[PDB]
Amino acid sequence: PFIECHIATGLSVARKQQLIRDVIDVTNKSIGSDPKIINVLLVEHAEANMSISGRIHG
Amino acid sequence: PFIECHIATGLSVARKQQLIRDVIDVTNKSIGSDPKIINVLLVEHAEANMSISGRIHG
Amino acid sequence: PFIECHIATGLSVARKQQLIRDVIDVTNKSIGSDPKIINVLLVEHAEANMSISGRIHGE
Amino acid sequence: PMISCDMRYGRTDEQKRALSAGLLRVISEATGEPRENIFFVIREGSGINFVQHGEHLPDYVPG
Amino acid sequence: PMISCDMRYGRTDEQKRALSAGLLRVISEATGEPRENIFFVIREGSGINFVQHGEHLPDYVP
Amino acid sequence: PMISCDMRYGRTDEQKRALSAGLLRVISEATGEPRENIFFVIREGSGINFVQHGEHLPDYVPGN
């Protein structure tokens, strides 16, 4: 699989590393994919540039 | 829906914020989606990193 | 086609432009697409934010 | 500019034309870019492929 | 947050439910964001559409 | 590196293989990244799903 995670800027380096590890782990466990075919991209955005459920930041 | 918009850097916060509002509204009007299931991501790029119809910037 | 390329930061602007030219060229050559229907987006990332085949950068 | 829309299967060709027309209009107004400089792609999937408020969506029903 | 997962067609609804539950939990835990503020989409395609180390994948078999 | 290509349904297996080989080569040469560190995904859809020059595309001819 290829998992792209769009998150707000601001997490520490250790937090981002652990998130990638955790994404790999839960993908492996839930659908059985060998880590060898799991690919992860973490991308950070300003909160202003993201809207979930039609919500405008601020 | 999830709408991802890749635009050139340099637009204003109000213009980007209005753009997000405009995309939510037009998705609502065109396909009838309730804003609660509309999600928008705005991503800004240097002009040199984008090519439409095989055009090379500059 | 719309081709999005996620690469590590570190290339020059000139090298990135050549990359786009070459992506357009190989797409045209491999599937016969006229450049007029080829679209390319290059996105740069820190190495730490990318994992291929479950590998963690630094390890 | 490049725009993508992931949404459930089931929209008519006419609905997709209305969506593109609207998105192109608003992107053009924001960026100053003409239609010639905008690309748009719709990506379709089943309801189970979309999760909002923690819950998977049902398959799309017109109306 | 917004999460997407591109994977081969063929996973069951039950497998997709387990995947979403897992990804939502770990993203929520990392970011401090409630599940209310997370969107997730799965995108599916044929095996030939997936290329890992230059090799095209076979179709998935559930 | 991770590469995606959104395009209409209808390209042959041979064409998809030629596309991946070419894109991998160009990316490798530009980035110094080995074959082992590159991922590529093709996302297919109907012609109506693609809009260029303000107009929706017809379906791709021929097909698979």
Side-chain angles (χ1 to χ4, degrees):
Chain A
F2 170 49
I3 299 149
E4 187 161 349
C5 298
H6 298 283
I7 60 169
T9 43
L11 295 184
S12 65
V13 69
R15 197 73 151 270
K16 290 183 273 191
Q17 275 193 66
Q18 192 57 52
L19 179 52
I20 295 174
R21 295 188 196 276
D22 286 352
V23 166
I24 296 164
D25 185 50
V26 85
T27 299
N28 168 246
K29 290 166 167 180
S30 61
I31 62 172
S33 297
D34 191 283
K36 81 200 190 303
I37 64 162
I38 303 173
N39 308 279
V40 184
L41 175 64
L42 188 53
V43 26
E44 307 166 71
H45 307 273
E47 292 274 40
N49 285 8
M50 294 186 291
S51 173
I52 304 284
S53 301
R55 290 186 290 263
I56 291 93
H57 180 74
Chain B
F2 171 47
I3 297 147
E4 189 166 356
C5 301
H6 299 280
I7 65 163
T9 184
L11 292 194
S12 76
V13 54
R15 209 161 287 254
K16 270 183 287 184
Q17 262 168 212
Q18 189 53 82
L19 177 50
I20 293 162
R21 279 186 263 246
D22 287 349
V23 295
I24 293 163
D25 177 52
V26 77
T27 305
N28 175 254
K29 296 280 101 170
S30 61
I31 65 173
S33 296
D34 190 285
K36 293 180 178 190
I37 63 162
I38 302 168
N39 306 276
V40 189
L41 177 65
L42 292 192
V43 194
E44 309 172 61
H45 305 274
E47 294 274 25
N49 287 355
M50 295 181 289
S51 171
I52 301 282
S53 288
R55 256 126 34 193
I56 306 302
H57 192 262
Chain C
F2 174 44
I3 300 156
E4 194 167 339
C5 298
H6 294 101
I7 63 165
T9 191
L11 278 56
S12 68
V13 171
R15 193 57 186 86
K16 286 182 268 180
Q17 290 190 4
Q18 182 67 46
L19 178 53
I20 293 172
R21 218 140 44 215
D22 290 330
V23 168
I24 292 158
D25 173 65
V26 292
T27 302
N28 173 69
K29 294 192 86 180
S30 60
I31 66 174
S33 297
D34 189 279
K36 288 179 186 174
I37 60 166
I38 303 171
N39 311 93
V40 185
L41 173 66
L42 296 191
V43 193
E44 305 167 74
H45 307 274
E47 292 271 26
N49 291 338
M50 298 186 285
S51 172
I52 303 285
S53 293
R55 291 187 291 265
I56 303 297
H57 179 76
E59 297 191 344
Chain D
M2 297 104 171
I3 315 305
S4 65
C5 178
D6 284 84
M7 68 176 180
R8 285 169 297 171
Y9 273 110
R11 276 73 177 205
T12 68
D13 284 14
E14 207 62 61
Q15 281 177 304
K16 295 177 175 175
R17 291 194 160 97
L19 180 64
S20 70
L23 257 43
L24 264 66
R25 181 182 88 247
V26 301
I27 288 289
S28 192
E29 180 75 3
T31 64
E33 294 287 343
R35 292 153 77 265
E36 278 175 34
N37 303 349
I38 304 165
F39 170 78
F40 175 49
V41 60
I42 295 163
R43 300 184 187 115
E44 297 173 294
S46 315
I48 195 76
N49 289 356
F50 294 81
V51 183
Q52 192 92 60
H53 324 287
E55 296 154 11
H56 291 251
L57 297 188
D59 287 331
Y60 173 73
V61 180
Chain E
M2 299 98 165
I3 313 160
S4 66
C5 177
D6 284 81
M7 68 179 177
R8 289 174 290 166
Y9 188 78
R11 277 74 180 203
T12 67
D13 285 7
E14 286 286 280
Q15 281 178 301
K16 295 175 175 178
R17 290 178 187 116
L19 180 66
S20 74
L23 290 174
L24 269 45
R25 172 175 53 87
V26 302
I27 289 286
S28 180
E29 197 178 15
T31 61
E33 201 71 65
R35 288 165 180 85
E36 300 89 288
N37 203 224
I38 306 173
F39 168 77
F40 176 50
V41 61
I42 294 164
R43 302 186 187 114
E44 293 172 294
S46 305
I48 190 88
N49 287 359
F50 291 78
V51 192
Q52 191 83 54
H53 62 261
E55 282 169 12
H56 291 251
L57 298 189
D59 284 346
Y60 181 77
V61 183
Chain F
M2 302 98 171
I3 314 164
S4 62
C5 176
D6 284 78
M7 68 178 182
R8 285 169 294 165
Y9 284 114
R11 274 76 178 201
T12 67
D13 284 10
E14 283 171 350
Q15 282 176 312
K16 292 181 175 176
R17 292 178 186 276
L19 181 63
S20 79
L23 293 171
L24 265 54
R25 177 182 89 243
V26 168
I27 291 297
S28 185
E29 293 173 357
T31 64
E33 296 270 11
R35 178 183 181 86
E36 200 183 33
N37 206 45
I38 301 166
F39 169 80
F40 176 53
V41 60
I42 293 166
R43 303 188 186 111
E44 294 173 300
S46 304
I48 192 76
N49 290 353
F50 292 83
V51 187
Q52 193 91 242
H53 326 286
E55 293 193 65
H56 297 244
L57 299 185
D59 300 301
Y60 175 75
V61 175
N64 197 235

